């Protein structure tokens, strides 16, 4: 009888653990829904064509300043390639303004498919040894990772 | 100025140093971590970081300071808790509400805004003053006055001395003019952590320590300004001896610098000493926090901070000795310090020596210990003060072949060698009386002679009895007490009585909390007199038997005196010397009645 | 007595299981409601952080 | 805070020796920066930066180095130190070595990321272990007791049942104050961290925790022997960080069982050897003391919070000794030492705890008239003395013969027999109340006459010598 009641208590504990695990899994599922919605919004952001160019210029400036390399080779999606080709030397001028350095000899070819890119640029350096992945999908999942505690704090009830 | 190149553990190599002298403290990174130079190879210089090095970049700026490791002195240094790099811990805990110690905190070692009372020592305008002269006294707290002295590297004529009143360390309390130029002085005094403070001349100590514990104060004494070494044992040792040296010692102040020890033990010490109402004055119950100071650096603290903690502790000892007090510094460190040297030496890729310790371990331990000794102070008035170094050694689990142990015993004058076997048997003071020694037994001759002109002989007799018992213990372990004669039997009886009555002490009760010298010497004289009289009686051989028959006669028909002897340890010191002395004199008279009354009927 | 005790234990276990299921359903409903309420603000904050560059 | 930067990705893996990959031509390399390694096959490992020098940087890899190529192996600098996510949901779950959940559940939703090797506690803010926890085992309760916030490492050798007694302590640990102590905060919320454990031991601990009804309370971080070696040098740090968050920032008393610290010294040895550093004793790294201090000094009550952390790191001596560097340093740092002797196991006593080598520095604080019988210290100090002197007597009688022994010698031998048999031995599932343990100890003591009881004071004798 003692071991029967002990096994019954163990079964009750296992049921409680299963219930709490189901609750936690539903929480994670809601977080995944949040991530999917954020990805959809990020994809929708690519529809713009005027502030989108400014954002691309800012991204390329940030990446080139982070590498601080003599010769990068930027890679951009075939879609909106015209925007990158248009911004062109503006980024080089901005970088040369940032510090007293000769303008980088950028090179722009192969492009990854749209959904893989979803905006943003990959800059890298000659021989591809050092790679900077400033894709919009890459900026996301880092902001998400950092802000996740704030997300849980927002999910009080 | 300079920038980081390499970051491995706590060793950082920063290029661009060029003219960066050795041990010139540098500040590393945006977080501004303290740090001392340890090696140079050209434009780059190795640095010890004294803090966690996680998160250092490459080309992260490093700023030089041109100043070696320095501790800030002055009023309020007493009764505080400082990190190894001398950060006020309570100040950090209050100023920042966070309970943690944040990385790279920059807090002054001493508060620069507290108002302190100033009492100039009759120094007139146009007078001549010199290094270490004692121009003003400040009452840091009741029952502990703090004299203020000029730094040893200062001199000049007194153009302006501040009047008596409330002052803060930011104010200039004194002005001097020398060699055609003038200099100012505040109540602060920065001093390099190494390069010990100057002394007019050293002296040979004569006053004993007279600590609370009976074994230490009687068998293996230490002099004020002496040098000791206990094997850092727990339950005993690091706790009971520390308490005796802190709250029940004649040293005018205490400096506990135990670093590289357990955090729970440090918290217990730092929470128990706040109350600690020791009767240091004649009729006052002032807490010893107005008398001591902690330089605690736990084990988890950075490895490079151990040497800094030890040297700051000994430097603080020097400031007080210079004022005039007889400071006594206790270091639960020097067991973790050797480990710190091994860590830094190995990381610096130094060639190891015997047993892997750096070859210069003896040199460092000497440069630390040899800063002890009573010293005639600098400046006017004439004055005298001392520093005592009761350090720690590896626990009694390793033989004396340990390089740290051999290095200590090659320098230390008094060895309170605690034995683990006594700790198993729960003998709490735990000093092994066969292996301990005190080279100060010759200098204390005058004090022993003046206190009691017959103590030396009774001490030698007690030593002989203990040695004889330890000698024939091996023989008994083979044959047994069957062959033991009258002399051997009485010697073992007296040795057992001495071991359980004299050499033990509970220290958790008023019977053995603090045994004054008079009570201890009276116990010794009583026991030795009993031994001598019993030996004479058994040598008389009256009644045709004498001998062991007389021994049984005195152990049975005269055993009340024996019980009073073994219970003499319970004479309450609170009753006062005129009462305990009378009680012991009466017990001595009763003992003299025995072995004469026992000889009356010829056994 | 033993049969009654085991029957009562089985009934109590069933009641506890039902209570756990009801509490789980309530918790899932609460979490879904909160996520639906705060999703747009969360996504707006995320996009604002993603779509900004300094220098 | 303003804008972020996506982590750089490199390919210049110019050197791979053992558990270390040596990157090159890197810029802005943080120290202890956590890196992500994507191999040619596409699997992702995670590593740490042990050393930064010029443009180079040496990276150890947790999951091993079985596939790195100088051409395809991509490494990415996250630019931050390790941060294990923590939440109240972390209770009642079982994890891998590095924190990945292995309970088939979802990953932790973090309340916050707390950097490993958490911020140092200013000693001016700690408090000495005040309350005592009842260990159930009588030998621990009567001598070598354990107070909340203590660091008691169980010293054992290969084959001894250290895991069994650890599980018994986990099942039996509880408060003692006036025998009065729901207590959900009083529930010890055990955090169990196993490093280098045979799979049988892990299954045993899992089953014991499940059976004891604590599955909603305990937490398991496992680094099995077959699991990569390097993760053993991170698992206890993760466990201690989780314990710190569960205790200090959540107000729960927390108990920690680090298992096989020698399996951590082995990881230290492997890492140090792989870096060609100067060795120490027996070839162990010269800074093993610093690492052991960092891993032990993270337990103890804190003044500003109602929580507490009490850890019981069990240890395995290599050749059943103490001079070995790891048990030696652990004895130096930790405030206690419980000794399990092969001699007792050979005599078939389930708790083989040798009460003579045992020691607890904070024993004098846990006991007292306010929470224990007034005679506890006397009782312990007398049993210890009689056992030690009786052992000496038995050693003497081993050569002089049983006939040469005296009446006191026979009393001491009988005391030894009944102490090692009736007192030390205890049921594998039966506890002993502290007062019941003291009653048993008094029964053991009352063998000797009142005269021989030198340590016990007469005041406690009058109230207890008869009972």
PDB file of N, CA, C and O in Angstrom, chain D residues 82-104:
ATOM      1  N   UNK D  82      29.888  34.806 -21.799  1.00  0.00           N
ATOM      2  CA  UNK D  82      28.798  33.858 -21.611  1.00  0.00           C
ATOM      3  C   UNK D  82      27.700  34.478 -20.763  1.00  0.00           C
ATOM      4  O   UNK D  82      27.974  35.134 -19.753  1.00  0.00           O
ATOM      5  N   UNK D  83      26.455  34.272 -21.176  1.00  0.00           N
ATOM      6  CA  UNK D  83      25.296  34.720 -20.408  1.00  0.00           C
ATOM      7  C   UNK D  83      24.259  33.603 -20.453  1.00  0.00           C
ATOM      8  O   UNK D  83      23.553  33.448 -21.452  1.00  0.00           O
ATOM      9  N   UNK D  84      24.171  32.833 -19.384  1.00  0.00           N
ATOM     10  CA  UNK D  84      23.139  31.811 -19.343  1.00  0.00           C
ATOM     11  C   UNK D  84      21.793  32.462 -19.050  1.00  0.00           C
ATOM     12  O   UNK D  84      21.683  33.254 -18.110  1.00  0.00           O
ATOM     13  N   UNK D  85      20.774  32.217 -19.865  1.00  0.00           N
ATOM     14  CA  UNK D  85      19.439  32.709 -19.528  1.00  0.00           C
ATOM     15  C   UNK D  85      18.941  32.048 -18.254  1.00  0.00           C
ATOM     16  O   UNK D  85      19.254  30.891 -17.973  1.00  0.00           O
ATOM     17  N   UNK D  86      18.169  32.798 -17.475  1.00  0.00           N
ATOM     18  CA  UNK D  86      17.643  32.312 -16.205  1.00  0.00           C
ATOM     19  C   UNK D  86      16.199  32.764 -16.063  1.00  0.00           C
ATOM     20  O   UNK D  86      15.832  33.859 -16.502  1.00  0.00           O
ATOM     21  N   UNK D  87      15.379  31.910 -15.459  1.00  0.00           N
ATOM     22  CA  UNK D  87      13.987  32.232 -15.180  1.00  0.00           C
ATOM     23  C   UNK D  87      13.504  31.309 -14.076  1.00  0.00           C
ATOM     24  O   UNK D  87      14.138  30.299 -13.769  1.00  0.00           O
ATOM     25  N   UNK D  88      12.371  31.671 -13.474  1.00  0.00           N
ATOM     26  CA  UNK D  88      11.797  30.814 -12.448  1.00  0.00           C
ATOM     27  C   UNK D  88      11.339  29.482 -13.024  1.00  0.00           C
ATOM     28  O   UNK D  88      11.249  28.496 -12.286  1.00  0.00           O
ATOM     29  N   UNK D  89      11.074  29.426 -14.329  1.00  0.00           N
ATOM     30  CA  UNK D  89      10.754  28.162 -14.978  1.00  0.00           C
ATOM     31  C   UNK D  89      11.942  27.210 -15.025  1.00  0.00           C
ATOM     32  O   UNK D  89      11.751  26.027 -15.323  1.00  0.00           O
ATOM     33  N   UNK D  90      13.155  27.687 -14.738  1.00  0.00           N
ATOM     34  CA  UNK D  90      14.321  26.815 -14.748  1.00  0.00           C
ATOM     35  C   UNK D  90      14.269  25.757 -13.658  1.00  0.00           C
ATOM     36  O   UNK D  90      15.060  24.810 -13.702  1.00  0.00           O
ATOM     37  N   UNK D  91      13.375  25.898 -12.685  1.00  0.00           N
ATOM     38  CA  UNK D  91      13.155  24.837 -11.717  1.00  0.00           C
ATOM     39  C   UNK D  91      12.447  23.661 -12.377  1.00  0.00           C
ATOM     40  O   UNK D  91      11.634  23.827 -13.289  1.00  0.00           O
ATOM     41  N   UNK D  92      12.770  22.461 -11.909  1.00  0.00           N
ATOM     42  CA  UNK D  92      12.128  21.263 -12.419  1.00  0.00           C
ATOM     43  C   UNK D  92      12.399  20.968 -13.877  1.00  0.00           C
ATOM     44  O   UNK D  92      11.474  20.593 -14.607  1.00  0.00           O
ATOM     45  N   UNK D  93      13.639  21.140 -14.325  1.00  0.00           N
ATOM     46  CA  UNK D  93      14.035  20.782 -15.678  1.00  0.00           C
ATOM     47  C   UNK D  93      15.444  20.216 -15.644  1.00  0.00           C
ATOM     48  O   UNK D  93      16.214  20.484 -14.718  1.00  0.00           O
ATOM     49  N   UNK D  94      15.776  19.428 -16.661  1.00  0.00           N
ATOM     50  CA  UNK D  94      17.077  18.781 -16.772  1.00  0.00           C
ATOM     51  C   UNK D  94      17.762  19.293 -18.029  1.00  0.00           C
ATOM     52  O   UNK D  94      17.120  19.459 -19.073  1.00  0.00           O
ATOM     53  N   UNK D  95      19.062  19.561 -17.930  1.00  0.00           N
ATOM     54  CA  UNK D  95      19.777  20.275 -18.976  1.00  0.00           C
ATOM     55  C   UNK D  95      21.067  19.564 -19.354  1.00  0.00           C
ATOM     56  O   UNK D  95      21.592  18.732 -18.612  1.00  0.00           O
ATOM     57  N   UNK D  96      21.575  19.926 -20.530  1.00  0.00           N
ATOM     58  CA  UNK D  96      22.882  19.487 -20.994  1.00  0.00           C
ATOM     59  C   UNK D  96      23.967  20.234 -20.225  1.00  0.00           C
ATOM     60  O   UNK D  96      23.697  20.997 -19.296  1.00  0.00           O
ATOM     61  N   UNK D  97      25.223  20.017 -20.615  1.00  0.00           N
ATOM     62  CA  UNK D  97      26.324  20.655 -19.914  1.00  0.00           C
ATOM     63  C   UNK D  97      26.334  22.165 -20.056  1.00  0.00           C
ATOM     64  O   UNK D  97      26.532  22.886 -19.075  1.00  0.00           O
ATOM     65  N   UNK D  98      26.124  22.665 -21.269  1.00  0.00           N
ATOM     66  CA  UNK D  98      26.230  24.091 -21.543  1.00  0.00           C
ATOM     67  C   UNK D  98      24.911  24.831 -21.378  1.00  0.00           C
ATOM     68  O   UNK D  98      24.847  26.024 -21.684  1.00  0.00           O
ATOM     69  N   UNK D  99      23.862  24.160 -20.912  1.00  0.00           N
ATOM     70  CA  UNK D  99      22.592  24.807 -20.670  1.00  0.00           C
ATOM     71  C   UNK D  99      21.497  24.495 -21.665  1.00  0.00           C
ATOM     72  O   UNK D  99      20.357  24.924 -21.453  1.00  0.00           O
ATOM     73  N   UNK D 100      21.797  23.784 -22.739  1.00  0.00           N
ATOM     74  CA  UNK D 100      20.751  23.396 -23.674  1.00  0.00           C
ATOM     75  C   UNK D 100      19.795  22.431 -22.985  1.00  0.00           C
ATOM     76  O   UNK D 100      20.244  21.447 -22.387  1.00  0.00           O
ATOM     77  N   UNK D 101      18.489  22.678 -23.026  1.00  0.00           N
ATOM     78  CA  UNK D 101      17.551  21.769 -22.359  1.00  0.00           C
ATOM     79  C   UNK D 101      17.486  20.422 -23.055  1.00  0.00           C
ATOM     80  O   UNK D 101      17.413  20.337 -24.283  1.00  0.00           O
ATOM     81  N   UNK D 102      17.512  19.360 -22.251  1.00  0.00           N
ATOM     82  CA  UNK D 102      17.441  17.992 -22.741  1.00  0.00           C
ATOM     83  C   UNK D 102      16.171  17.289 -22.286  1.00  0.00           C
ATOM     84  O   UNK D 102      16.037  16.081 -22.469  1.00  0.00           O
ATOM     85  N   UNK D 103      15.233  18.022 -21.694  1.00  0.00           N
ATOM     86  CA  UNK D 103      13.981  17.454 -21.220  1.00  0.00           C
ATOM     87  C   UNK D 103      12.916  17.389 -22.300  1.00  0.00           C
ATOM     88  O   UNK D 103      11.727  17.307 -21.972  1.00  0.00           O
ATOM     89  N   UNK D 104      13.312  17.437 -23.570  1.00  0.00           N
ATOM     90  CA  UNK D 104      12.409  17.448 -24.717  1.00  0.00           C
ATOM     91  C   UNK D 104      11.460  18.638 -24.703  1.00  0.00           C
ATOM     92  O   UNK D 104      10.500  18.670 -25.483  1.00  0.00           O
TER      93      UNK D 104
END
